[PDB]
Protein backbone atom coordinates (compact mmCIF):
# COMPACT_ATOMS: atom_id res chain seq x y z
CA UNK A 1 0.00 0.00 0.00
CA UNK A 2 1.34 3.39 -1.08
CA UNK A 3 0.38 5.90 1.61
CA UNK A 4 0.79 9.61 2.17
CA UNK A 5 -0.33 11.56 5.20
CA UNK A 6 0.27 14.94 6.75
CA UNK A 7 -1.10 16.79 9.73
CA UNK A 8 -0.84 20.45 10.65
CA UNK A 9 -2.31 21.19 14.07
CA UNK A 10 -1.05 24.72 13.55
CA UNK A 11 0.63 26.45 10.61
CA UNK A 12 4.24 27.65 10.66
CA UNK A 13 5.56 30.41 8.41
CA UNK A 14 8.33 29.04 6.22
CA UNK A 15 7.11 25.43 6.28
CA UNK A 16 8.34 23.98 2.97
CA UNK A 17 5.64 21.29 2.89
CA UNK A 18 3.08 23.89 1.81
CA UNK A 19 2.92 25.93 -1.40
CA UNK A 20 1.17 29.28 -0.96
CA UNK A 21 -0.35 30.98 -4.00
CA UNK A 22 -2.01 34.34 -4.53
CA UNK A 23 -3.03 36.15 -1.35
CA UNK A 24 -2.62 33.23 1.09
CA UNK A 25 -0.45 33.95 4.12
CA UNK A 26 0.44 32.14 7.35
CA UNK A 27 0.33 34.50 10.32
CA UNK A 28 2.75 34.56 13.24
CA UNK A 29 -0.13 33.26 15.36
CA UNK A 30 -0.19 30.12 13.22
CA UNK A 31 -3.31 30.85 11.18
CA UNK A 32 -3.59 30.28 7.44
CA UNK A 33 -5.36 33.29 5.94
CA UNK A 34 -6.47 32.22 2.45
CA UNK A 35 -7.69 35.68 1.46
CA UNK A 36 -6.19 39.06 2.31
CA UNK A 37 -7.11 41.18 5.33
CA UNK A 38 -6.20 44.87 5.08
CA UNK A 39 -4.15 46.74 7.67
CA UNK A 40 -7.39 48.20 9.02
CA UNK A 41 -8.36 44.68 10.08
CA UNK A 42 -11.17 44.17 7.58
CA UNK A 43 -11.23 41.57 4.78
CA UNK A 44 -10.13 42.69 1.32
CA UNK A 45 -12.36 42.21 -1.70
CA UNK A 46 -11.11 40.87 -5.05
CA UNK A 47 -8.72 38.54 -3.22
CA UNK A 48 -7.86 34.96 -4.20
CA UNK A 49 -5.49 32.66 -2.36
CA UNK A 50 -4.64 28.97 -2.33
CA UNK A 51 -2.46 26.57 -0.36
CA UNK A 52 -1.30 23.27 -1.84
CA UNK A 53 0.52 20.38 -0.20
CA UNK A 54 4.00 20.52 -1.77
CA UNK A 55 3.96 16.90 -2.92
CA UNK A 56 1.63 15.29 -5.46
CA UNK A 57 -0.64 12.48 -4.28
CA UNK A 58 -0.99 9.12 -6.04
CA UNK A 59 -4.76 8.68 -6.22
CA UNK A 60 -5.16 5.87 -8.78
CA UNK A 61 -2.95 3.47 -10.74
CA UNK A 62 -3.77 2.47 -14.32
CA UNK A 63 -1.43 -0.55 -14.35
CA UNK A 64 -2.99 -2.34 -11.38
CA UNK A 65 -6.32 -0.55 -11.71
CA UNK A 66 -6.43 0.38 -8.02
CA UNK A 67 -7.92 3.55 -6.55
CA UNK A 68 -7.01 5.22 -3.27
CA UNK A 69 -9.34 5.86 -0.36
CA UNK A 70 -8.64 9.14 1.38
CA UNK A 71 -9.72 11.38 4.22
CA UNK A 72 -9.10 14.99 5.07
CA UNK A 73 -10.05 17.03 8.10
CA UNK A 74 -9.72 20.75 8.67
CA UNK A 75 -10.96 23.58 10.86
CA UNK A 76 -11.89 26.96 9.46
CA UNK A 77 -13.83 30.10 10.21
CA UNK A 78 -15.55 32.58 7.93
CA UNK A 79 -16.38 35.93 9.47
CA UNK A 80 -18.75 38.21 7.58
CA UNK A 81 -18.38 41.63 9.26
CA UNK A 82 -21.12 43.26 7.16
CA UNK A 83 -24.56 42.10 5.99
CA UNK A 84 -24.41 44.58 3.11
CA UNK A 85 -23.10 44.58 0.53
CA UNK A 86 -23.57 40.80 0.22
CA UNK A 87 -20.48 38.85 1.35
CA UNK A 88 -18.60 36.50 -1.01
CA UNK A 89 -17.34 34.13 -2.20
CA UNK A 90 -16.26 31.12 -0.13
CA UNK A 91 -13.58 28.45 0.23
CA UNK A 92 -13.05 24.99 -1.23
CA UNK A 93 -11.04 21.82 -0.69
CA UNK A 94 -9.86 20.56 -4.07
CA UNK A 95 -7.90 17.95 -5.97
CA UNK A 96 -6.72 18.51 -9.52
CA UNK A 97 -3.81 18.29 -12.01
CA UNK A 98 -0.31 18.66 -10.59
CA UNK A 99 1.58 21.94 -11.06
CA UNK A 100 -1.71 23.85 -11.04
CA UNK A 101 -1.85 27.62 -10.68
CA UNK A 102 -4.81 29.75 -9.53
CA UNK A 103 -7.74 29.89 -11.94
CA UNK A 104 -10.37 32.65 -11.85
CA UNK A 105 -11.35 34.20 -8.53
CA UNK A 106 -14.74 35.40 -7.34
CA UNK A 107 -17.51 32.84 -7.74
CA UNK A 108 -15.08 30.42 -9.41
CA UNK A 109 -13.26 30.09 -6.08
CA UNK A 110 -9.82 30.09 -7.68
CA UNK A 111 -10.19 26.65 -9.25
CA UNK A 112 -12.38 27.05 -12.35
CA UNK A 113 -12.37 29.51 -15.26
CA UNK A 114 -16.04 29.53 -16.25
CA UNK A 115 -19.33 27.88 -15.32
CA UNK A 116 -19.15 25.19 -18.00
CA UNK A 117 -19.05 21.45 -17.33
CA UNK A 118 -15.70 20.47 -18.84
CA UNK A 119 -13.91 17.10 -18.51
CA UNK A 120 -10.57 18.82 -19.11
CA UNK A 121 -10.69 20.52 -15.70
CA UNK A 122 -10.01 17.10 -14.13
CA UNK A 123 -10.91 18.70 -10.81
CA UNK A 124 -12.88 17.57 -7.77
CA UNK A 125 -13.89 19.97 -5.05
CA UNK A 126 -15.95 20.31 -1.89
CA UNK A 127 -16.93 23.94 -1.41
CA UNK A 128 -18.37 26.07 1.27
CA UNK A 129 -20.16 28.68 -0.85
CA UNK A 130 -21.25 32.01 0.58
CA UNK A 131 -22.61 33.92 -2.45
CA UNK A 132 -25.41 32.80 -4.77
CA UNK A 133 -24.19 33.05 -8.38
CA UNK A 134 -26.43 32.39 -11.38
CA UNK A 135 -25.43 28.70 -11.36
CA UNK A 136 -26.06 28.35 -7.63
CA UNK A 137 -29.09 27.32 -5.64
CA UNK A 138 -30.71 30.36 -3.95
CA UNK A 139 -29.67 29.28 -0.45
CA UNK A 140 -26.32 30.37 0.92
CA UNK A 141 -24.18 29.40 2.43
CA UNK A 142 -24.15 25.85 1.09
CA UNK A 143 -21.80 22.90 0.87
CA UNK A 144 -21.36 21.60 -2.64
CA UNK A 145 -19.66 18.72 -4.40
CA UNK A 146 -18.04 20.01 -7.59
CA UNK A 147 -17.00 17.59 -10.30
CA UNK A 148 -15.37 19.30 -13.29
CA UNK A 149 -17.66 22.30 -12.82
CA UNK A 150 -18.51 25.13 -10.43
CA UNK A 151 -22.12 24.00 -10.86
CA UNK A 152 -22.35 21.37 -8.10
CA UNK A 153 -23.78 17.91 -8.68
CA UNK A 154 -25.18 18.16 -5.14
CA UNK A 155 -25.58 20.87 -2.50
CA UNK A 156 -26.57 21.13 1.15
CA UNK A 157 -27.51 24.48 2.70
CA UNK A 158 -26.06 25.29 6.12
CA UNK A 159 -26.34 28.16 8.57
CA UNK A 160 -23.16 30.12 9.13
CA UNK A 161 -22.16 30.58 12.77
CA UNK A 162 -20.50 33.93 12.08
CA UNK A 163 -16.81 33.93 12.92
CA UNK A 164 -17.01 30.63 14.80
CA UNK A 165 -14.80 27.62 14.08
CA UNK A 166 -16.21 24.82 11.95
CA UNK A 167 -14.81 21.29 11.79
CA UNK A 168 -14.87 19.45 8.49
CA UNK A 169 -14.33 15.79 7.63
CA UNK A 170 -14.30 14.58 4.04
CA UNK A 171 -13.88 10.88 3.35
CA UNK A 172 -13.73 8.92 0.12
CA UNK A 173 -14.26 5.14 0.06
CA UNK A 174 -12.87 3.71 -3.19
CA UNK A 175 -14.79 0.44 -2.91
CA UNK A 176 -18.20 2.13 -2.88
CA UNK A 177 -17.10 5.32 -4.69
CA UNK A 178 -18.86 7.40 -2.04
CA UNK A 179 -17.47 10.82 -1.19
CA UNK A 180 -18.99 11.77 2.15
CA UNK A 181 -18.51 15.08 3.92
CA UNK A 182 -19.53 16.43 7.30
CA UNK A 183 -19.48 19.93 8.78
CA UNK A 184 -19.83 20.53 12.50
CA UNK A 185 -20.04 23.78 14.48
CA UNK A 186 -18.95 22.90 18.04
CA UNK A 187 -20.25 26.28 19.22
CA UNK A 188 -23.87 25.55 18.31
CA UNK A 189 -23.69 21.77 17.96
CA UNK A 190 -24.99 22.00 14.38
CA UNK A 191 -24.21 19.01 12.16
CA UNK A 192 -24.51 18.89 8.36
CA UNK A 193 -23.90 15.92 6.09
CA UNK A 194 -23.71 15.45 2.33
CA UNK A 195 -22.69 12.54 0.12
CA UNK A 196 -22.52 11.56 -3.53
CA UNK A 197 -21.09 8.92 -5.83
CA UNK A 198 -17.86 10.05 -7.50
CA UNK A 199 -15.71 7.80 -9.70
CA UNK A 200 -12.33 9.49 -9.25
CA UNK A 201 -10.69 7.33 -11.93
CA UNK A 202 -13.05 8.97 -14.45
CA UNK A 203 -12.45 12.47 -13.09
CA UNK A 204 -8.93 12.94 -11.75
CA UNK A 205 -5.52 12.25 -13.23
CA UNK A 206 -3.43 9.51 -11.58
CA UNK A 207 -1.38 11.98 -9.54
CA UNK A 208 -2.96 15.11 -8.08
CA UNK A 209 -2.20 18.25 -6.13
CA UNK A 210 -4.35 18.63 -3.03
CA UNK A 211 -5.23 22.01 -1.62
CA UNK A 212 -7.53 24.66 -0.21
CA UNK A 213 -8.62 27.82 -2.04
CA UNK A 214 -10.54 30.91 -0.98
CA UNK A 215 -11.88 34.03 -2.65
CA UNK A 216 -13.67 37.29 -1.86
CA UNK A 217 -16.02 39.18 -4.20
CA UNK A 218 -15.46 41.36 -7.24
CA UNK A 219 -17.47 44.28 -5.80
CA UNK A 220 -16.11 46.66 -3.15
CA UNK A 221 -16.60 45.28 0.36
CA UNK A 222 -18.17 42.06 -0.90
CA UNK A 223 -15.80 40.15 1.37
CA UNK A 224 -15.26 37.94 4.40
CA UNK A 225 -12.36 36.11 6.01
CA UNK A 226 -11.35 32.55 5.06
CA UNK A 227 -9.11 31.37 7.89
CA UNK A 228 -7.89 27.80 8.33
CA UNK A 229 -6.53 26.65 11.71
CA UNK A 230 -5.53 23.03 11.09
CA UNK A 231 -5.45 20.53 8.25
CA UNK A 232 -4.75 16.80 7.98
CA UNK A 233 -4.84 14.40 5.04
CA UNK A 234 -4.27 10.71 4.41
CA UNK A 235 -4.52 8.58 1.29
CA UNK A 236 -3.97 4.83 0.91
CA UNK A 237 -3.47 3.29 -2.51
CA UNK A 238 -3.40 -0.51 -2.72
CA UNK A 239 -0.28 -1.30 -4.75
CA UNK A 240 -1.76 -4.51 -6.16
CA UNK A 241 -5.07 -6.25 -6.87
CA UNK A 242 -4.86 -10.03 -7.19
C1 LIG B 1 -18.90 35.34 -11.73
C2 LIG B 1 -18.40 36.04 -10.49
O1 LIG B 1 -17.27 35.85 -10.08
N1 LIG B 1 -19.28 36.87 -9.90
C3 LIG B 1 -18.92 37.62 -8.70
C4 LIG B 1 -19.68 36.96 -7.54
O2 LIG B 1 -19.12 35.69 -7.26
C5 LIG B 1 -19.61 37.83 -6.29
O3 LIG B 1 -18.26 37.87 -5.84
C6 LIG B 1 -20.05 39.26 -6.61
C7 LIG B 1 -19.91 40.18 -5.41
O4 LIG B 1 -21.07 41.00 -5.40
O5 LIG B 1 -19.22 39.76 -7.67
C8 LIG B 1 -19.41 39.06 -8.90
O6 LIG B 1 -20.81 39.09 -9.23
CA1 LIG C 1 -21.16 30.92 -5.40
MN1 LIG D 1 -22.16 26.74 -5.16
Tab-separated table of C-alpha atoms and ligand atoms in Angstrom, residues 89 107 129 131-133 135-136 142, ligand 2:
chain	number	residue	atom	x	y	z
A	89	UNK	CA	-17.339	34.125	-2.202
A	107	UNK	CA	-17.506	32.839	-7.738
A	129	UNK	CA	-20.165	28.684	-0.851
A	131	UNK	CA	-22.610	33.918	-2.449
A	132	UNK	CA	-25.408	32.799	-4.767
A	133	UNK	CA	-24.190	33.049	-8.382
A	135	UNK	CA	-25.428	28.703	-11.359
A	136	UNK	CA	-26.060	28.351	-7.630
A	142	UNK	CA	-24.153	25.851	1.092
B	2	LIG	CA1	-21.159	30.924	-5.403
